[PDB]
Nucleic acid binder design. Structure first.
Ligand SMILES: [Mg+2]
Ligand SMILES: [Mg+2]
Ligand SMILES: [Mg+2]
Ligand SMILES: [Mg+2]
Ligand SMILES: [Mg+2]
Ligand SMILES: [Mg+2]
Ligand SMILES: [Mg+2]
Ligand SMILES: [Mg+2]
Ligand SMILES: [Mg+2]
Ligand SMILES: [Mg+2]
Ligand SMILES: [Zn+2]
Lengths: 142, 47, 118, 221, 38, 168
RNA sequence: GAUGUUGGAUCAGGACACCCAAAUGGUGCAGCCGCUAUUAAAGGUUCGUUUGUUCAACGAUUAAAGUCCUACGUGAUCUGAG
RNA sequence: ACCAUAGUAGGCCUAAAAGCAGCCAUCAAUUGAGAAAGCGUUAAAGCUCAACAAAUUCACCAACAUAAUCCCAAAAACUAAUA
């Protein structure tokens, strides 16, 4: 009956918003998903909140595919900042190297969306670079 | 007001084809006019 | 043959004949179609009546006009007729009237495509 | 299908105070002495404010007319709220109203004097630009919401740009050189033929019969 | 219906038809968009 | 008497109305109308960057593809199409799409003519580099309504039964 | 060298910019009431208390107790409270 | 007509703010799809527009209720007119 995007933190999944308001509307059992989503996600101790796709079926049961963490967060950690710049491109938030984009790209290469795209590491790198440019995070290439 | 008006000179400068049209001779102007009165002097100014 | 009058344009629908009985609320207005339905003679009669000069002689010459809805005329009036007048309007033919000679003789203007269904 | 190069604005500069200014109901130095009403200042073609300055767009007046305060109110609120303040700016091509208009109370017999001052108005001649809108927008936007303010003015009015204006003017003289009938209003009125000058006004020589009273007819050659 | 001076389609689903020598706006999605030119 | 300027539009003295009706604009009248004249002169189009890019890329397309198959483009959900592209990735087989407008007149020049009737419909060009036919047919066997009309292999135009043969 | 002027009485002719009756569109129309819009002038459109009063208030009802014009209809038909 | 996946509910705010309350940015996958022009939702979810692909092309500058005795020549596409 519906498809639910949610970007959810590693060790944190709880029977309340956004999880309650979104999945609970479809009539989905929250606790099952808390314990299961955590079963997979608690095991990421590197502290990286992951966008995750929850398909809900007409009988109100559900399945979930866990994706790699958002690029915004990978750049937040790679540049070591707190939050993105208030004004992007007017103000620079943090710095990353030619290496950082390579890493963040090779990590996110396996996304449900990037899996079906053959395009090489250069293109995924350009993607990470755009997602950086919106965050106010500059690239430095040596 | 109403007035005696005027006619600006350009009116009276004939084009080349007006000779061909009214059958006037371009070289020599003609000596006498035959003037007939077609319309009334009523409803017209005194002058 | 009065009943078979033709009216040019849309006149059948929008020409009105008005009459008044003189009694308050005695004002009638009839559409040419309805008037022609009730009285087959009426239309040509009011046509002619309005075209004579307006003097008294109108009434008299109005008396010498004889109108018949179809072609049925008493032997009396048939027997005393002198002359046949020419039709003012030329009545156009329909499609079925044309001799096959004439239809075959007329050019087929455009070339129709075969794959088009007609 | 087919791509075509998109028109770009590299030279378009957005000035400060981009919105229309507020015009004052009464002049700051109020006229003390009631003036005769010249119909003549609404009459015929316009001289001032015929040409663009900074902007690409304008509202062109296709008749003469009297603009009073309530109109300014409309054009102002409307054109301000309708436009993108980043990409667009507007300008008054018309002064704030300087001409006193007089009334007498109701139930007044004729005579006794001239009445008292009720009003203030700006005279506007046919062929003048009321509002000038510059910006990096295409004429389609401005034309979209300008047509409202035009439609709401006293005189008939149009929404135009430089290209539009020049096109319609070149066409306007094309008609006068394409004219197939030997007789134009100019030729007759100037040659006083058929003593026509008896029915015509003295201003008729200049208007060439295209303007009549307050109204303007664009199709008159 | 409404008798109007100027018809204008209010949504994507208004179709504009000439009947009885008038212009009507008919709309199946919403009836309140019905108009009739005078 | 009415003032020189008024709003009620001001009826004109009759002699002036006649003056008006005489001086109206009369438009130039053609001997023969332009559209009913013969065809206009020729406004020929010219190659853009896109047209040169497509001619050159399509020219390279017949070079690199050893098996060029024409598979009718059929509407599948983004799911089916992406899964399809991933399987084609798994055998390394490629798929490419082109505009019919620029693909058509290129093949109407010299070599590849026999493909012309196949390109009037909706087409999808299956690019096969060092291919095996069995594997290309593997996928078109899974989904029934996604037909293969064949085309060019090593300069020879070949059809469905032919591919059934080259596979075996 | 006079076109006698308010309101009633009597008798009403007409308009439709419908108050009722008659067909219908839309609704923030479930139904009952409604609120709006379109088409329709053959017929209707009350009786009282106070004011000279038309207007207005108020009592009681009706399917409704229309808005107007006709020399603010109508005094060689009537009434003069004004 | 036909059709609609991608990082990514871009940052920032915010109860939430996911194109679509406002500020900033306008980037980068695909061959092709705006960090979005409509509606829509509490926010989502969902409908269409723009992009290919398939074709064919012809246009666009639209209009405006009524009065009081009873409508107000009759009619009319055409035998030739500087009458
Ligand atoms: Mg106006
Ligand atoms: Mg007398
Ligand atoms: Mg009556
Ligand atoms: Mg009515
Ligand atoms: Mg009645
Ligand atoms: Mg009276
Ligand atoms: Mg009386
Ligand atoms: Mg009397
Ligand atoms: Mg979504
Ligand atoms: Mg792109
Ligand atoms: Zn609609």
């Amino acid at each position: 009956s519906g498809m639910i995007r949610a970007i959810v933190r590693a060790g944190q999944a709880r029977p309340g918003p956004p999880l309650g308001p979104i999945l609970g509307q479809r009539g989905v059992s929250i606790n099952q998903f808390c314990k299961e989503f955590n079963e997979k996600t608690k095991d990421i101790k590197e502290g990286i909140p992951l966008p995750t796709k929850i398909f809900v079926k007409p009988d109100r049961t559900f399945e979930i595919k866990i994706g790699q963490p958002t690029v915004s967060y990978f750049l937040k950690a790679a540049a070591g900042i707190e939050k993105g710049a208030r004004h992007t491109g007017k103000e620079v938030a943090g710095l990353v190297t030619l290496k950082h984009v390579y890493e963040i790209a090779r990590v996110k290469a396996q996304d449900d969306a990037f899996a079906l795209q053959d395009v090489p590491l250069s293109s995924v790198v350009r993607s990470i670079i755009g997602s950086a440019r919106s965050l106010g995070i500059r690239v430095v290439k040596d | 007001k109403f007035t005696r008006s005027r006619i600006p000179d350009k009116v009276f400068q004939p084009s080349p084809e007006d000779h061909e049209k009214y059958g006037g001779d371009p070289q020599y102007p003609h000596k006498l006019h035959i003037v007939t009165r077609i319309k009334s002097t009523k409803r017209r100014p005194y002058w | 043959n009065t009943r078979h009058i033709a009216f040019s344009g849309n006149k059948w629908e929008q020409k009105v004949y008005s009459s008044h009985t003189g009694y308050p609320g005695g004002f009638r207005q009839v559409t040419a179609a309805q008037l022609h339905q009730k009285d087959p003679v009426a239309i040509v009669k009011l046509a002619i009546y309005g075209m004579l000069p307006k003097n008294l002689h109108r009434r008299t010459m109005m008396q010498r006009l004889h109108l018949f809805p179809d072609e049925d005329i008493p032997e009396d009036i048939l027997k005393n007729l002198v002359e046949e007048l020419p039709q003012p309007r030329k009545v156009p033919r329909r499609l079925d009237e044309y001799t096959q000679e004439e239809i075959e003789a007329f050019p087929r203007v455009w070339s129709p495509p075969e794959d088009y269904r007609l | 299908k087919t791509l075509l190069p998109v028109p770009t604005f590299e030279d378009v500069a957005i000035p400060e105070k981009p919105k229309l200014r507020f015009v004052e109901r009464v002049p700051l130095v109020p006229k003390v002495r009631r003036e005769r009403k010249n119909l003549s200042d609404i009459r015929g073609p316009s001289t001032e404010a015929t040409e663009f300055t900074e902007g690409r767009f304008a509202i062109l007046a296709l008749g003469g007319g009297y603009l009073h305060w309530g109109h300014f109110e409309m054009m102002r609120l409307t054109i301000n709220r309708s436009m993108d303040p980043k990409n667009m700016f507007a300008l008054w091509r018309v002064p704030a109203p300087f001409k006193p208009i007089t009334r007498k109370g109701m139930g007044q017999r004729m005579g006794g004097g001239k009445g008292a001052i009720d009003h203030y108005v700006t005279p506007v001649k046919a062929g003048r630009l009321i509002v000038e809108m510059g910006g990096r927008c295409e004429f389609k936007e401005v034309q979209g919401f300008l047509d409202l303010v035009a439609h709401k003015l006293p005189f008939p009015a149009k929404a135009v740009s430089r290209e539009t204006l020049e096109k319609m003017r070149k066409d306007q003289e094309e008609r006068e050189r394409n004219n197939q009938n030997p007789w134009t209003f100019e030729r007759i009125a100037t040659a006083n033929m058929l003593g026509i000058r008896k029915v015509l006004s003295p201003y008729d020589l200049t208007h060439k019969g295209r303007y009549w009273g307050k109204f303007y007819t664009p199709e008159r050659v | 219906f409404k008798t109007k001076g100027v018809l204008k389609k209010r949504c994507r689903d208004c179709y504009l038809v000439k009947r009885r020598g008038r212009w009507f706006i008919y709309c199946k999605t919403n009836p309140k968009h019905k108009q009739r030119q005078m | 008497g009415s003032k020189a300027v008024t709003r009620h539009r001001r009826v004109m003295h009759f002699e002036r109305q006649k003056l008006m009706a005489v001086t109206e604009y009369i438009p130039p009248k053609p001997t023969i109308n332009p559209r009913c004249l013969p065809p206009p002169p020729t406004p020929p189009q010219e190659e853009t960057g896109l047209v040169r890019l497509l001619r050159r890329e399509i020219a390279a397309v017949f070079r690199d593809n050893r098996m060029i198959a024409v598979c009718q483009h059929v509407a599948l959900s983004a799911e089916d199409k992406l899964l399809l592209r991933h399987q084609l990735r798994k055998h390394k087989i490629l798929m490419k799409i082109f505009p019919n407008q620029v693909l058509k007149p290129f093949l109407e020049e010299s070599k590849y003519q026999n493909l012309l009737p196949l390109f009037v419909g909706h087409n999808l060009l299956l690019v096969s580099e060092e291919p095996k036919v069995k594997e290309m047919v593997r996928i078109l066997k899974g989904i029934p309504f996604l037909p293969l009309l064949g085309g060019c292999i090593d300069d020879t135009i070949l059809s469905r039964q032919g591919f059934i043969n080259y596979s075996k």
